[PDB]
Each structure stands twice: as C-alpha cells, then as structure tokens.
Amino acid sequence: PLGSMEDFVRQCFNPMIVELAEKAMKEYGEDPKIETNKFAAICTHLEVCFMYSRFEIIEGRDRTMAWTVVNSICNTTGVEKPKFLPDLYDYKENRFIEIGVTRREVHTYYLEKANKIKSEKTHIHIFSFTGEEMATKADYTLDEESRARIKTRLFTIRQEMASRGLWDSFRQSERGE
Ligand SMILES: Nc1ncnc2c1ncn2[C@@H]1O[C@H](COP(=O)(O)O)[C@@H](O)[C@H]1O
Numbered sequence: 705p706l707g708s709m710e711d712f713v714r715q716c717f718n719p720m721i722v723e724l725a726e727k728a729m730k731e732y733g734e735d736p737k738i739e740t741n742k743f744a745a746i747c748t749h750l751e752v753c754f755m756y757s758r759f760e761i762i763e764g765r766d767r768t769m770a771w772t773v774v775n776s777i778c779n780t781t782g783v784e785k786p787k788f789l790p791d792l793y794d795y796k797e798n799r800f801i802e803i804g805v806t807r808r809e810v811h812t813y814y815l816e817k818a819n820k821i822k823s824e825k826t827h828i829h830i831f832s833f834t835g836e837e838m839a840t841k842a843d844y845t846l847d848e849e850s851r852a853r854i855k856t857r858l859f860t861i862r863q864e865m866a867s868r869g870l871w872d873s874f875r876q877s878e879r880g881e
C-alpha cells in the first residue's frame with residue numbers, strides 16, 4: 705500500500721496541468737518518471753496559480769513567451785522588470801506576484817523567496833498544505849473565500865496523497881531552491 709506518485713499525478717491533476725508540468729521538468733532535464741515528488745509539487749504550484757488568477761498568467765508559459773509577456777507589461781506600465789520571472793501580473797494593484805506552495809514553514813519559504821528575487825515591488829504570496837499563508841505586507845489580494853478554496857484544494861491533494869501512502873515522502877522531500 706505505497707502507490708506510485710507518477711500515477712497519482714496523472715490521475716488527480718487536470719491533464720493541461722500535468723502537460724505543463726512535464727514541459728517545465730523536461731526543460732530542466734528532470735524526468736517526471738523519476739523525480740516524482742518534484743512533479744507533484746510542480747503540478748500543485750501550477751494549479752494554485754491558475755486558481756489564484758484581473759490577472760495575467762506567467763507561470764506555465766514557454767520561457768520565451770513568458771519573458772515577452774513580462775517585457776510587454778513592463779514597457780507598457782511603469783513597472784520594474786523582475787530579475788526572475790514571476791508567476792502572475794495583477795492589472796489592479798499593478799504588480800507582479802510570486803506564488804509559493806510549501807511543505808515547510810511558511811516564513812522560512814517566504815524569506816527564501818524574498819531573498820532570491822530582491823525586489824521591493826514584486827508581491828509574494830505563500831500557501832502551505834496546513835492552511836497557513838503569508839503575503840507581502842499582510843496584503844492578501846484575494847478575498848477570504850477565494851483563499852479558502854485554494855487552501856481546500858491543498859488539503860484535498862494532501863489527503864489523496866495520504867490515501868496512497870505518498871504523503872510521508874512528499875512532505876519530507878522539499879529542499880531550499
Ligand atoms: N508551470 C511551471 N513551470 C515550472 N515549474 C513549476 C511550474 N508550476 C510549478 N512549478 C514548480 O513550483 C514552484 C514554481 O516555482 P516558483 O514559481 O519559483 O515558486 C517550483 O517548485 C517549481 O519548480
């Protein structure tokens with residue numbers, strides 16, 4: 705009763721999500737059949753981006769199209785150009801957003817992300833599988849039920865992993881970037 709994380713991924717995520725995630729892994733020479741906890745994390749983070757998004761999706765795009773979209777927004781608006789390539793753009797609050805989904809402590813992950821991107825303008829919003837969240841300046845952007853729907857989906861993933869004996873490994877395998 706330990707299942708295959710690959711089979712879980714292909715069965716419990718939307719195929720559009722799985723295909724984007726495989727595309728993203730193959731781009732970096734990681735194999736979805738091998739690095740399966742990573743495959744699941746990737747799909748989960750994609751699904752959160754899509755649920756969160758008013759918003760232009762950046763994550764999930766081919767890197768040349770993602771930078772085209774970033775540059776196009778930056779040279780249309782005032783906005784500072786990110787050094788990395790965020791997840792979303794918010795046309796309302798006029799800023800890029802980095803979304804994180806973590807199996808570690810949310811403050812730890814948040815500050816890792818803040819330290820990587822070194823931006824005063826890009827908003828960071830971190831979700832955990834425990835239902836904890838942390839967002840830049842305690843500005844949460846979306847309303848309560850929209851964030852609750854994201855947390856609920858995270859719990860559903862976790863329980864469905866547990867059901868297959870996949871949670872233990874998945875939850876223990878996250879490293880710093
Ligand atoms: N569409 C995607 N393309 C590449 N990596 C992704 C995608 N969705 C999720 N991920 C993974 O989920 C997190 C996304 O990276 P970041 O956008 O820096 O939080 C990292 O764990 C990524 O490797």
Ligand SMILES: [Mg+2]
Pocket residue numbers: 763789790791
């Ligand atoms: Mg991203």
